[PDB]
A paper describes a structure:
Fructolysis is not robustly regulated and is initiated by ketohexokinase (KHK). KHK catalyzes the phosphorylation of the C1 hydroxyl of fructose to generate fructose-1-phosphate (F-1P). Alternative splicing results in the production of two human KHK isozymes: KHK-A and KHK-C. In most cells, the expression of these isozymes is mutually exclusive. Kinases in the pfkB family, which also includes ribokinase (RK) and adenosine kinase, are characterized by two structural elements: a large central α/β domain where the active site is located and a small lid domain that covers it upon substrate binding and catalysis.
In this study, we determined the crystal structure of KHK-A, one of two human isozymes of KHK, in the apo-state at 1.85 Å resolution, and we investigated the roles of residues in the fructose-binding pocket by mutational analysis. The final structure contained two homodimers in the asymmetric unit. Each KHK-A monomer was well refined, with good electron density for residues 3 to 298, a crystallographic R-factor of 0.216, and an R-free value of 0.249. Each KHK-A monomer consists of two domains. The central α/β domain comprises a nine-stranded β-sheet flanked on each side by five α-helices, resembling the conserved Rossman-like fold. A four-stranded β-sheet extends from the central α/β fold to form the lid domain. The protruding β-sheets of the lid domain of each monomer interact with each other to form the dimer interface of KHK-A. The two monomers are related by a two-fold axis of rotational symmetry, forming an isologous interface. The protruding β-sheets of each monomer are packed and oriented orthogonally to each other. Additionally, a central bend in strand β3 wraps around and interacts with strand β7 of the other monomer. For example, S28, I30, and C32 of strand β3a stabilize the dimer interface by forming backbone–backbone hydrogen bonding interactions with residues I110 and Y112 of strand β7 of the other monomer.
Author numbering:
A (entry chain C): -3 to 298
B (entry chain B), D (entry chain A): 3 to 298
C (entry chain D): -2 to 298
Amino acid sequence: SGLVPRGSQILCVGLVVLDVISLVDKYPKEDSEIRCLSQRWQRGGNASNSCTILSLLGAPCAFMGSMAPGHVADFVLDDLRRYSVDLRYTVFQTTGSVPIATVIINEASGSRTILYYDRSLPDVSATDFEKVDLTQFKWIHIEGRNASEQVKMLQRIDAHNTRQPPEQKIRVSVEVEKPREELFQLFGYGDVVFVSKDVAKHLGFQSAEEALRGLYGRVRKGAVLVCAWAEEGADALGPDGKLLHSDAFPPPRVVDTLGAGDTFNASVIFSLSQGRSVQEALRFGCQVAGKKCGLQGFDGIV
Amino acid sequence: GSQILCVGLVVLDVISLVDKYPKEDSEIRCLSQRWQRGGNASNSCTILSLLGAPCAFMGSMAPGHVADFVLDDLRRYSVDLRYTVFQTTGSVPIATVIINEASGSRTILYYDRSLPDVSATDFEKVDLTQFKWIHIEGRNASEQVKMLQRIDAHNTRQPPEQKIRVSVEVEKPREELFQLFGYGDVVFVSKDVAKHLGFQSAEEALRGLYGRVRKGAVLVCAWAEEGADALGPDGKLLHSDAFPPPRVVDTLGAGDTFNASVIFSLSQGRSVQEALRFGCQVAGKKCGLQGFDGIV
Amino acid sequence: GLVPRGSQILCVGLVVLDVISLVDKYPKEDSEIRCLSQRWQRGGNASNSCTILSLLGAPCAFMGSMAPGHVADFVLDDLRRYSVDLRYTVFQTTGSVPIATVIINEASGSRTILYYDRSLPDVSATDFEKVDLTQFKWIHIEGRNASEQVKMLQRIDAHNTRQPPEQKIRVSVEVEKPREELFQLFGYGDVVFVSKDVAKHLGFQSAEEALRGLYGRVRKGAVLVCAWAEEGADALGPDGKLLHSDAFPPPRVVDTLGAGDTFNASVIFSLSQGRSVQEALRFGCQVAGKKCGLQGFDGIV
Amino acid sequence: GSQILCVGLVVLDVISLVDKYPKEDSEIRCLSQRWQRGGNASNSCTILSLLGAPCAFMGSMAPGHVADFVLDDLRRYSVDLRYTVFQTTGSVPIATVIINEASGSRTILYYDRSLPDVSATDFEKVDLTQFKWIHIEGRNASEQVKMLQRIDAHNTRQPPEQKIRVSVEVEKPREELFQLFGYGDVVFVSKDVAKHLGFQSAEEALRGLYGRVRKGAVLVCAWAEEGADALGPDGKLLHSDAFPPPRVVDTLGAGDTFNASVIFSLSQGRSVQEALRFGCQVAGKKCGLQGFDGIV
């Protein structure tokens, strides 16, 4: 079958989530009873979905995430296997369970409304990451969660990199998606930093451009800051000071926006990993994300 | 001859408790999440059981995890499983229930999985001598009319003390159920049905629908914070006020609770007036608690 | 549709996961041998009884403890395949389904069982109290937790005091493992099965001796049955007359796992059909003999 | 260049512990039962990890539940997973192991599930600069010869102090494994292979087979309760007696424990005599313990 060659995979570190998805014909009225058009299970979590898209795009990838044995684990693991995502670095846990997101998708508009049920699964630790043999990966993408622990991980990778020739340097990306103050440290790590519109608004920014000019001072020297802003497309700012923008590329009809953000992030990583410019990565990300929005789930993108 | 039979649906309720109703396109954290056996007739068995009346659930099931959960839960409440009917296609339906803990509202996204209904032919095999009361949740009305006629015919051969009392619930607003009004000693009509039919109060609905019941029958309409009313053959409109709890936290199955409490009270020989008061009392208590257990 | 009254045979007892290794020769201690094959098969005396009953065409139900999980999904899936009624499964919040590691020697068809208990709570008398008896014409109880099973047997007897003859429930008990608490069960049921292993453990050299020596312990009117593998089986009832059937050996004996369950279930079937004790004995030997020439159970029919 | 790589099999050991060895056709109750990650190279990493030596497992796995257990366990011992090779056909082999707690004996019913082996093409991708020692469990000899030739060629460009040390285990009496004797710094031959070659002691086996090893190589043969012997280039036969525990409860993986401990000792720069003694000491200790953890 083949040993995985050095420096050949993209690693994504973060959460797996079970999405239990109900499609409805209009957004439910409070205290009413509505009939589901359909209902399905779908693997989710930001880093988990990134691997789906990377895979679909034809990038070898690996997922590192906590896991608990069980029926839900069986489903998300089996799904991860379907997309040939390398799972050697799954971290099994003896307490807690995989979280469940109950997702209401309104077919009127493609909107998605998420009721998140946390089930106490322990996060991947810095001492878990210490065990990872870095020779396997050309790019490591980290979904911000437990900051002080992830900082140690990012520090580990930077230290590896001080010992590597240019062909063997590991590119790093970070996602700051949840509006929690402890994630603010993460801006100062990584070659590419993704900040969400949600965090941007919570941090007092009115636009993507304002967010990027406002937060660029927090990134490490040389970093590219990326902020996606839904129907207003996506922007980026790198060390040259030039604000880059892509318009959104909506499909003719929006039916399912769940994981559109992850589709953007993964598409930007793919494009950059393939040696495209940041400008090109931005447009590709918005194009792939918009195509996804016209489809149920992820498969029809390729 | 001492059991109460409840014929209807069983539903898996997958319940999420939230601090406010979710805005569309937002992500909110659940305070908690639980599985709960539901369905109208199924919930009625739960309350009867808690009140101390031996009961049996008659309804369709399918093999698998969901049915195993609901069967186990039925067992925990000592609900007699003799008349469960295992179907070879379809699956137990699943209600995703959002309970807003700000108000106790329950919003239900219902996912049907094509489970066949129990038929008149299934009902023909039921041993009617086991039951003092049979309650039918309106579902497949042409078949259920045949069940009701079976009970009626049975009752023509019984002395007074051996007569099986019958209640019917019309709880979904589907016209095919109108037929069912014409059977039973007690007929329950839901506020939701009443409102869909154009009615704006319990008394308005009772006066608007009493034409449809058979001679001697009592029509009953519960109206949430407005208590419950009843109208019987003497023409006297009866009412109980509600019994709201200190805070309403969970109104899922409150109407089932009311119906079961009324059946319990009536099956025990109480007046329709006392039956309304007790249904209002128990259902109001239920609304102040998660699930059903704390009612007793 | 709805199961008619008095129509099913209920079997109360254990479900077990059998993990079966087929080997060309019985392994020598401290050696390493290659498995010819390896399979998962649902087992447990009461569980296996239902398989045979379903195969013979008798509507049946299984009541035993179950713990959610993978092993449960395997045995539950397999129970459903034979259309066994599962409404009286007693799911438990502790413990797991036991695993029996079984070595089958292809040279002889012997079965050696390494049994691993996984602390699953047993079906209790309170559990049994909830069973609506109107569904069943025959109840078979695999002896396990005897003081609780005696209450179940007492409940069935009381039920029967209120039934016309068409509605009387017939009862069998199995004493298969040589454990002291079980021997109390000899005194209940219309039909009492005692294994060759138990007989030998109590110091009896033959099916005849075991039946003479144990008959004083059964209740008035009962039939005591003791199968003796390749020597056939015996039965003894109130008339003091020992009945026998010789074994019906297969061309080659390839798998004897569940032969005893096959026997028991086929006797129950034949009796439940109104056959004589002599005929049920014969038929039990006939079906268990056939099973011994086949891997698993499906080939009996 | 500080890790030890162990190339060979992982096997799932499904272990039943009993108080007596089973009589054929009987039924016996297990004292206990457990899964243990096994296989010669896999066990080697467990021991190296416990002794304090950073190591890596190279070997085939198939995605699925069993691999998840194996990877988790490897994770727990901090064994580097980089050179695990995922196969798209076959599955991890399963060894059903009966351990008689009265003697500590282990009887193995092996179920092979057709897992493709690690190839020399896989080995070509290994970063040799990561490792100071490489241990190869003899299996697919023509492929492993190519691996050993690759290591030899790498060593021709290293100075004395950056040379990769190499061990080979010949554990099966298969004629194809004999060519592996000519490779490596340390060659392990089991008591079983030795007896099959007609040797009646470790001393006879060493004398009889030393001619098959390359110039300067050390040949080692463990003889269980009789200890272990070695022979190197000076021609001096070395021996250590066994170190039996108070009682022998579990001898599964005792050969792997010996080999790994010898490798460890030698990797730390100890004499061959000291390494023999240490391997006997650790292996002896293991045999008095269920599994591996209690050795340190």
